[PDB]
Design a binder for these strands. Sequence first.
RNA 1: CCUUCUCAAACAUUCUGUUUGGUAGUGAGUGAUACUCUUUGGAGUUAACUUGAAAUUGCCUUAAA
Lengths: 53, 257, 133, 65, 240, 159
Amino acid sequence: RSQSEREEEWLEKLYKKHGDDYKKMFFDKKLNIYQQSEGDLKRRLLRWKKRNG
Amino acid sequence: AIPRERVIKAVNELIKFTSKPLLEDDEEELKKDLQLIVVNNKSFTGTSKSFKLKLLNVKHSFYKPWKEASATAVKDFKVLLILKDSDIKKVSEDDLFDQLDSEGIKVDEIICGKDLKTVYKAYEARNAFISQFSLILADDSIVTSLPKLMGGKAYNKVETTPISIRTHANKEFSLTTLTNNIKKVYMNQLPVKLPRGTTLNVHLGNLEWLRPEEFVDNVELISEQLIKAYQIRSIFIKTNRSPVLPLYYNQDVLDEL
Amino acid sequence: EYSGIIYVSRLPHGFHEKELSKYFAQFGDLKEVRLARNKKTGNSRHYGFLEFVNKEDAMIAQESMNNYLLMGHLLQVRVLPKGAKIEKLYKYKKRVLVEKGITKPVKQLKDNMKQKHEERIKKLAKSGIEFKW
Amino acid sequence: PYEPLIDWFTRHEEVMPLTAVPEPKRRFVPSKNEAKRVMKIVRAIREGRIIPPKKLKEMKEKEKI
Amino acid sequence: NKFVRAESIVAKTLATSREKERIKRVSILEDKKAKNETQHIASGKDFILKITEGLIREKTTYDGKPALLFIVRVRGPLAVNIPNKAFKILSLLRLVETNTGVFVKLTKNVYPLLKVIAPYVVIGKPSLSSIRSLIQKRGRIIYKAEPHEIVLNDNNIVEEQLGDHGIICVEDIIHEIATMGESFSVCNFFLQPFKLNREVSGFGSLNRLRKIKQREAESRTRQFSNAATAPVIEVDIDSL
Amino acid sequence: KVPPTIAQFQYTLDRNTAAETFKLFNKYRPETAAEKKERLTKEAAAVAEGASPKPYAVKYGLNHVVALIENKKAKLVLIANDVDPIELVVFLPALCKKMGVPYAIVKGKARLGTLVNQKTSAVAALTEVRAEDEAALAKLVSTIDANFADKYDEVKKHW
RNA sequence: CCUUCUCAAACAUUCUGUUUGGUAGUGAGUGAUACUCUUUGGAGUUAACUUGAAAUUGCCUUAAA
C-alpha cells in the first residue's frame, strides 16, 4: 500500500510542526483538522517514515 | 523641578498606609494598592469634552509588570487591536506574533469595525467582550467611528477606551509601523484622558509595581510633561480616596484666571 | 375599570414623542403623549405615557401593541385602572454648561488657596500621615 | 363528552433528554462526504473530464463574439 | 389612507436624525474652514474622489480653476426624508424630480453645497461628446400664458428666445455649456434641465432580476461616507 | 367540532411576528444544489493546483427535526398548519412542550419550503445560530413565547 | 425593522521616525472623599461594579399598484 500525496503533505506538516510529540499533535487545531486519535497519527507517521528518511 | 525628597516621603507614607493590622479580593486589593496622581487645572480642555488620550512618555510603563503580575489574579490582562476592514485581511495573527514574540508582548485578538457592529452589537455581549481586555489599540482612521460602534460605556474608564496607534507609512499601510508602534505604546507610553473639568487624574498602577525610586522618576517625568503641556495647578499623589499628598504648588496660574 | 391613560415601555431608541403621536393617531385621537427624558442629556428613557380621548381607542391600541416586536424591542403597553391621571413630564433637552463663578478677584483666591493648602497639610497630619509642604 | 385536555404528562418539562447516544466525531469534524466529492471532482479534472470554472469562463469570454 | 406601521416611522426618524447630524457637522466644519480657523479640524484641503471601473479609487484635491460638472438625482437614501437644508439646495437647482440633471459651474462657494447634496446626487465631469449627445437628444423650451413645455425643435426658436448673445442654434448652447462662456449661467437656467429616463424602466420576471442586479451594483459603485470631511465622489458620467 | 388536539393549529403567529421570524430564517438559507456544486468545484480546482468553521443552516427534515427535539438541542421549531397527514404533526406541539423547546405554528407548508429551497417543508427548526443573531434569536424566542403560550394559552382547550 | 462622522497636514523620505489636529455616548441603579468654583442654589472634574435594548412620571415615489 501507499499514502496519498495530500496525506503525505499533511504528515510532513505534522512532522515539521511538532516532530514526534503525538500528544501535542493531538491538539493541533490548524494541522489536525480531523481530530484523529494519537494512535492513528503515530501509525500514519511511522508509515510515512518507513517510505522516507 | 520639584525635589525628589517630597516624592520619596509621599511614596514611603503610601507604603506605610498600604499595610494595616472574606476570601476573594473584592475591593481591598485595589483600594490600598492603586497609585494615582491628581492634577488640578483651570478647566482642562474646557472648549470641548473630547475623548482624546494623551500618551505620556514613560521609561518603564506599568504594562510589562501588569502583564507579569496579572497571572495571579482572576482578571487576566489582555491587549485588543482594532483595525480597518481593508487592512485586516493583510494583517495576520501569525506574523504579528512572530514579529512581537521577540519583544515578549502578545496580541490576544484583532477586531474590525465590521465585527463591532454585527457580532458585538448587543449591549450585554459588548460589555462582556470589552471588559475582558485592559489595553485597547485602535487604528487612527477608525477611532472616530469607534465611539458610535462601541458605545460610551467603554469610555467611562481609561483602560476600556481605545488608544490611537499609527499604522500607515507614506500614506500606505505598513506592517512594521503597527509592529513597532504597539511596542512603543506598551513599553514607552502612558495613556491618560483629558476630562472637561478642573481635576485631572493619572492612574500610575498598583503599589507593588515599578520600584518606588522608579515610581518617583515616573512621577517627575509625568509632572514635567504636564507642566510643559497645560497651566496645571496644585498636584497631589493619592491612593484610592486616601489622604492627599501635595507634590506641586503652582501660583502664577491663578493670576491668569 | 380602566382609564384612557396608557403606559408604554421598551421604546426603541429614537422613538420620540412625534413618532408615537403619528403612530397612535390612527386609533381615534390621542389627547396627549409624553415621553420620559433625562435632564443632562436629551435622549429618551425608552418609556412614556399617552392618553386617549376614548377608552375604546386605548384598549384597541393596547391589544394591537400588547407584544408588538419593533426592530429588536417587544413593546409592552398597559392600560392603567380608572383614574391614575398622567403626571408632569418635562421636555428635557441637552444641557450645556455655562461658566459664572469667576467674579472673585485673583488676589483674594490666592490667599484662599494658601489657607486651603495649609488646612490640607494640617488635615493630612491629623490623619496619621507625616508630611510637609 | 367535550372536555379540555389535561397536561398531567406535559405539566413538568423534561430536564434530561431521552437517549444518551454519544455524539459521533463527524459532528465535531468537517464532513467526509464533502471531502470525497471534492476528491472525485479533482480526479475528474485531472483526467481531463471536468473543465474548471475559470477555464470555462476563459473559453466563453473568447466565445460569444 | 393606508395604515402606517411603527417600524417605517421609527426607521425614517432615525435616518432623518442621522442625516441632520451629518449635515449640521458638515456645515459647521465648512463655515469654520471659510473663516480660516483651520487650527483644529480633521482636514482643511478639499478632496474629490473619482471612482471608475476592477474598481479603482483616485483621490485628488480641488483647485480654484472653474470646471464643468453634471449632476443627476439618485433618490437616496431610501428612508431619509430630504431635510430643509438640503431641500433649499435642491429647490434652487430644481432637481427635486428623480432622474433630473443639470449643468453647474464648479466653484469654491459651490463645493459646500455639493458636499451637502453628495449622497442625494451623482456628479462628474462629462466629455464634449456626452454633453453634445445629451443636449441634442433631449431638451425643452417653454412657449406661450406659457403653460407649454414643448421639446426643442427649431433653431429659429432659439433665436427668438435669447437672440441677443448670438445664441441662434442648439450648437451655440452646446458650446456655451461645454465651454466656460459668459452666457453659461443664462443659458443653463433657461435650458429647462433634462429629464433623463430611468435605468431599468420595466417590471416583470426578467425586469425584476435586472433591477435587483442594478440595485446591488449601485451599493458597490456608490457609497455614503457620512464623514465631516467626506470627499466628493465622482463617477464616469460619460457611460450614462 | 374537533377534539382539543385538533384546532390547536391555525392559531398562528401575528403578521409582525411571522414576518420577523421569516426574515431571520432567510439569513440561513441552506445552499442549493447549484451553490454547493459550484463551491465543491472551486474547492477541487484549488486542490488541483494547491479550516472553515461549522456551517450554519436551518434544520427542517421531519425525522431530523424530531430527532433534534427530545435532545434539547433545537431552540426554535416552526410547524406547518396544512399537513395533509395531520397525524405526522399532531404530536409535535405536545412533544415540544414536554421537552420545553420553544415552538410556533406558521401558516402554510409551502412557506416553510420556500426558505429551505424545497417545494413543501413540514417543519423548520434552528439548532445553532451565529453570535450576531444570538440576541436576535433570544428576542424572537421571547416574542414567540409571549404571543403563543400566553396569548393562546387556551389553544389546548375548548375543543 | 434604515445603518453607525474606516484620517489631514509640517519636518525627516532610514519606506517609517518626530509634532499637531479630527472621537459629544442606551438608560437606570450601587458606590470609594479630593479639586476648584460662585457664595448657594450646586456647575464641571475624581476609584470601582450589575444589566435580555431591562425601564411607571426628577419643576425625492417602478420595495407603484
